[PDB]
């Protein structure tokens, strides 16, 4: 070995919108790079803000800056052991940050909080703390308080030591000064909350807190560390990364509250030879297992492959298994990306990050494991759009590309609705799809224009046994056209609520209409049926029975009969009871209790109607019959009300009549 596992920190800097992840990373590397002297993964060292701890290996992991890359973001949560979740003193708890925090709960990632940009206008640390408490549902525990509002930003009050921290230039050297009187009264209030939150860790500490009414600084970091790992609390810290004031203390909290590879549950994988689940404990003696997280490429050096080791040791020259595929790869040269240098390594132990230079087939999310003892370690779309090429000719090669892109990207979906002549491409973000279309426009050639999906409205009749006459007479191009038929139309069969799809055609003619012209009548009706009688939308189905009609042997032909049948079927616009229909979805909302009031009333803001309500762990499960039209942007509107906590499922349920405000505007469209 080299450095002991307990001295390792595999962390991720989770920051999204107005957080300043880019600055916070450059800073982390800067402070660590200097402090020590006295890319996808950045191997650094931290001895302490005031050199107070032992030398630790903090493995700064790149987390994605967009929630639309769900797979990349779910994986980064497995590559790290603990999270440094960055917020903006201003913005605070945004919808973007809510989603990562929810998937983090899914993997149970111990976290600490960084409330960056305390310098920017409208920034207040405690407001964000209430937002973390009230909207993120964990238990935030401030270990610091803030000095100065916006422009007034000097530093932090370390609530454990109870000495106000001011900064000295480049914000690495700090002044352990005193709490100013204005803050003295508040620091007490928050310190008591922290000491109490630390006290409820183990029974030992509660009896010591109950003795005096306090605990030692070491007994405070003990309690706060236990519940951090237990995923019961999030220690909070504030600062300004760009204005340098605060980044070393954050790195300390990483040392203090975040776990080492052993202090998290053993990565649960699957038996390669999948119906069985085996697992690997962060142990050198456990058979080797790791996952590849970033396949980068340097021009001179070659193809890098960022690999987080979970269990065992791997040395330059080893021959492993790519368990995903089945292929056996041989491990070549290895390195570890530092702040600026590329440091050449020989072996890589459990719970560490090394780069595999020049490798054969090693895809992202690939398990590299022990040949002898093997294991393999490694979603519903949110947004859907209507796609079509700029020039109608392209059409076949659009579906070739999209079909391939959906096979390349599993987080991307393609489906066609033929009755509406629509291709529906879907995924995780407006962004995700803007990128996919862009890739099709370039790397595939098919230029395509995207639009909001159109509602596939259908049509129906109500009046049964309606006998309509179709009379076609046109005198053109040196010929006569004669078509004459009477057809009796009955309404399409209904369940309960479900309408029977298709045309039910019958022949009730005594012999006035010839034998050979009859199929042309079916074709005419069918043609009209898909051309639409009311507002020009296909009819769901129809009962149609021809029974009368004269003919002129010379001027009468199949096409004249096709026309007269369509002429008759069109007249159902007045003589039929032409009801326009709309798709009705079988929706299911899983909401926590608070949000149930908002959600339930929003389903009614969508003409939706309640078909049952169960009681679950956190809240309600509401089953509802809601029109697809009113379902526009649900995944988002729902992630809004539930504060990113709810989930919804849907499927098509039936067809039902549409409202007059919709219908009348659909007939005015004609």
């Amino acid at each position: 070995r080299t450095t002991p596992i307990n001295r390792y920190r595999n962390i991720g800097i989770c920051a999204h919108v107005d957080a300043g992840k880019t600055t916070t990373t450059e800073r982390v590397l800067f402070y660590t790079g200097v402090n020590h002297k006295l890319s996808a993964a950045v191997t650094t060292f931290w001895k302490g803000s005031r050199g107070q701890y032992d030398n630790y290996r903090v493995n700064v992991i790149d987390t994605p800056g967009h929630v639309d890359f769900t797979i990349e973001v779910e994986r980064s949560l497995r590559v790290l052991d603990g999270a440094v979740v960055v917020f903006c003193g201003t913005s605070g708890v945004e919808p973007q940050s809510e989603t990562v925090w929810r998937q983090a709960n899914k993997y149970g990632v111990p976290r600490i909080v960084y409330v960056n940009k305390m310098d920017r206008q409208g920034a207040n640390f405690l407001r964000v703390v209430e937002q973390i408490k009230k909207r993120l549902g964990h238990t935030p525990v401030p270990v610091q308080l803030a000095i100065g509002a916006e422009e007034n930003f000097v530093g932090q009050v370390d609530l454990i030591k109870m000495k106000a921290i001011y900064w000295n230039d480049k914000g690495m050297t700090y002044r352990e000064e005193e709490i100013p009187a204005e803050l003295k009264d508040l620091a007490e209030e928050w310190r008591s909350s922290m000491v109490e939150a630390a006290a409820e860790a183990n029974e030992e500490l509660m009896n010591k807190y109950l003795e005096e009414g306090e605990l030692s600084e070491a007994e405070i970091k003990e309690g706060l560390r236990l519940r951090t790992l237990a995923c019961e609390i999030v220690p909070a810290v504030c600062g300004s990364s760009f204005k340098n004031k605060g980044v070393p203390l954050v790195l300390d909290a990483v040392i203090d509250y975040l776990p080492a590879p052993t202090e998290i549950p053993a990565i649960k994988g699957v038996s390669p030879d999948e119906t069985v689940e085996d697992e690997r404990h962060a142990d050198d003696n456990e058979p080797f297992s790791s996952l590849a997280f970033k396949i980068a490429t340097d021009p001179f050096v070659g193809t890098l492959t960022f690999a987080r080791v979970y269990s065992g040791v791997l040395s330059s020259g080893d021959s492993v298994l790519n368990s995903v595929k089945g292929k056996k790869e041989r491990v070549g040269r290895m390195v570890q990306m530092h702040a600026n240098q590329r440091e050449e390594i020989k072996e890589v132990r459990a719970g560490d990050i090394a780069a595999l230079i020049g490798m054969k087939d090693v895809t992202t999310g690939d398990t590299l494991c022990s040949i002898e003892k093997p294991i393999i370690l490694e979603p519903e779309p949110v947004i859907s759009v209507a796609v079509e090429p700029k020039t109608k000719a392209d059409q076949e090669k659009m579906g070739i590309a999209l079909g391939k892109l959906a096979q390349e990207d599993p987080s991307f979906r393609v489906k066609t609705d033929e009755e509406s002549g629509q291709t529906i491409i879907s995924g995780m973000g407006e962004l995700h799809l803007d990128i996919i279309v862009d890739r099709m426009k370039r790397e595939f050639g098919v230029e395509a224009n995207i639009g909001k999906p159109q509602v596939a409205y259908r049509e129906t009749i109500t009046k049964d046994n309606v006998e309509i006459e179709g009379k076609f007479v046109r005198q053109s191009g040196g010929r006569g056209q004669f078509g004459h038929c009477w057809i009796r139309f009955s309404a399409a069969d209904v369940d309960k609520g479900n309408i029977t799809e298709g045309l039910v055609f019958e022949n009730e003619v005594g012999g006035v209409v010839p034998k050979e012209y009859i199929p042309a009548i079916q074709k005419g009706i069918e043609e009209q049926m898909k051309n639409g009688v009311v507002a020009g939308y296909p009819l769901i189905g129809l009962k149609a029975t021809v029974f009368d009609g004269s003919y002129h042997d010379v001027d009468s032909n199949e096409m004249a009969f096709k026309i007269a049948a369509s002429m008759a079927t069109k007249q159902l616009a007045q003589k039929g009871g032409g009801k326009v229909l709309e798709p009705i979805m079988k929706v299911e909302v899983v909401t926590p209790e608070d949000y149930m009031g908002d959600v339930m009333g929003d389903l009614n803001r969508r003409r939706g109607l309640i078909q049952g309500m169960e009681d679950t762990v956190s809240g309600k499960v509401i089953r509802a019959e809601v029109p697809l039209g009113e379902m526009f942007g649900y995944a988002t509107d729902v992630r809004s009300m539930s504060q990113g906590r709810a989930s919804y499922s849907m499927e098509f349920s039936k067809y039902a009549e549409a409202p007059s405000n919709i219908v009348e505007a659909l007939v005015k469209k004609q």
């Binding site: 519903e380 779309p381 859907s384 979906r413 489906k415 066609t416 609705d417 509406s420 629509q422 529906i424 879907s426 999906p453 159109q454 509602v455 596939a456 798709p583 979805m585 697809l628 039209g629 379902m631 526009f632 849907m650 499927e651 098509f652």
Partner: peptide, 8 residues
């Protein structure tokens, strides 16, 4: 006509 499931 409206989502990933085609349906409608």
């Amino acid at each position: 006509x409206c989502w990933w499931g085609x349906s409608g």
